[PDB]
Amino acid sequence: VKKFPEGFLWGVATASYQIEGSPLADGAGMSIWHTFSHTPGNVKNGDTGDVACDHYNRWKEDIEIIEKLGVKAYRFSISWPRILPEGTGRVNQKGLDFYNRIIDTLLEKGITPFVTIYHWDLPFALQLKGGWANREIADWFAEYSRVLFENFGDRVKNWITLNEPWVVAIVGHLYGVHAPGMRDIYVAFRAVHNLLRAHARAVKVFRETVKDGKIGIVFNNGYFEPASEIRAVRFMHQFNNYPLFLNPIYRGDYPELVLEFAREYLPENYKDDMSEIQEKIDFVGLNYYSGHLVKFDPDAKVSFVERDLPKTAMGWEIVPEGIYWILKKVKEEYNPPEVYITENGAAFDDVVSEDGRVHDQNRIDYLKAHIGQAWKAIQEGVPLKGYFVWSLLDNFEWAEGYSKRFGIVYVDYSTQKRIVKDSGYWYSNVVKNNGLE
Numbered sequence: 001v002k003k004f005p006e007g008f009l010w011g012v013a014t015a016s017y018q019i020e021g022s023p024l025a026d027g028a029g030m031s032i033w034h035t036f037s038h039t040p041g042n043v044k045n046g047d048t049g050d051v052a053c054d055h056y057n058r059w060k061e062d063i064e065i066i067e068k069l070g071v072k073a074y075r076f077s078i079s080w081p082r083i084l085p086e087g088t089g090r091v092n093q094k095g096l097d098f099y100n101r102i103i104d105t106l107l108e109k110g111i112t113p114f115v116t117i118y119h120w121d122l123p124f125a126l127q128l129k130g131g132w133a134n135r136e137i138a139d140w141f142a143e144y145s146r147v148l149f150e151n152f153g154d155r156v157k158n159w160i161t162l163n164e165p166w167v168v169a170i171v172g173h174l175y176g177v178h179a180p181g182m183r184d185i186y187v188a189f190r191a192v193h194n195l196l197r198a199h200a201r202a203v204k205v206f207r208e209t210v211k212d213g214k215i216g217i218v219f220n221n222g223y224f225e226p227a228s229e230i231r232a233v234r235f236m237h238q239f240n241n242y243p244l245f246l247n248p249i250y251r252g253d254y255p256e257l258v259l260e261f262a263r264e265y266l267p268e269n270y271k272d273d274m275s276e277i278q279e280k281i282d283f284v285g286l287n288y289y290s291g292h293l294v295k296f297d298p299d300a301k302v303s304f305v306e307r308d309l310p311k312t313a314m315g316w317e318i319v320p321e322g323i324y325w326i327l328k329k330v331k332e333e334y335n336p337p338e339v340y341i342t343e344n345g346a347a348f349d350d351v352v353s354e355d356g357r358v359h360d361q362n363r364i365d366y367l368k369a370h371i372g373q374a375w376k377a378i379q380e381g382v383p384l385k386g387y388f389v390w391s392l393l394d395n396f397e398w399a400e401g402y403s404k405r406f407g408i409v410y411v412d413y414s415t416q417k418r419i420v421k422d423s424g425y426w427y428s429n430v431v432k433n434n435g436l437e
């Protein structure tokens, strides 16, 4: 058997725009994902977050699912424009009420809330002012965060400033594939920098406002391997994984190969902000899904090489030892006091059999394998305090729309019926047992 430490936090994870629907209900401001998805060509099948999982109405049912599964922590995000419709200034009490009900319900049922402050749904009003491109976002984000701390910090004690700032900056402002849908390398790296400054200002406000909680930040990570017998792998790690942000946070500068590729794109006096950026954090959240074979390619001088390996419906290579690797490497490089796996999961072509069940043995195999590799890292001293399945529900998968299903619970979108998948039942047993058998 593989048993986890006593008090280890088994969770599931969602994000506001992906599950809620009703983006304009009860006085909410538009977000950049509302305007991005309502722009033709941006999202597969013209899908939007207008309805999604209707979690905005069905929130109590979904929490009852969490409870019934015996899952101990719930990671969810707050929609900034439900709280502050113009991004700053006015506070919307109905936005606060919505999350207050979710928070109290969780606590009442003994589920630990993990709140992601920003999971990509920036108020549109602030995008008009430059969004992440604008240095003033450090103030806007701090003011938003202060509101959340004041209203919920009595109850929520576990906070995440940002989900995947690399994706926010690069995918949103260089690749143009995510909101706000831009393609400018100089903008993209000013967003990287400003995300760091906004994060640190929010951590600083947290210390003034919530004297009894913990705060961290979440990063996407891939397991990169070299196609042969390696610097391209070093680059991909420093650029795509946690070092892009953790080197500034812990060592007060960007990683070396990031500076080689991108120095010219960063502000000229960016080191002036580095000492504020080193605001002390309580934990690092690492998201992990996939491995990649990498080679130098002259024609960022890196290309991916396809491998004949099992893949998910995203076409992502299933590489479980990656989660062990990234856990080891974070300890070795930055030694944060706590680590959580804040997302791990897989998309498969889920079908409801005529027995009424969803026989996702592919997902069970995926999760089991990665949970085992996370166990290993704990045995070798990684201070891993928790693990979160992405996702509780099938949901709006950004530019893929509804076509990719990551849930341990199946959502039939024509009825909004929730059907717990085999993987959900399987995970419930793991949580009950506090590990694998």
Ligand SMILES: CO[C@H](O)c1c[n+]2c([nH]1)[C@H](O)[C@@H](O)[C@H](O)[C@H]2CO
Pocket (backbone or CB within 6 Å): 015, 018, 163, 164, 167, 220, 221, 287, 289, 343, 390, 397, 398, 406
């Ligand atoms: C780029 O990092 C990860 O591949 C990643 C995967 N995922 C994520 N990040 C995001 O945090 C979620 O909002 C996605 O729904 C989820 C599934 O795609």
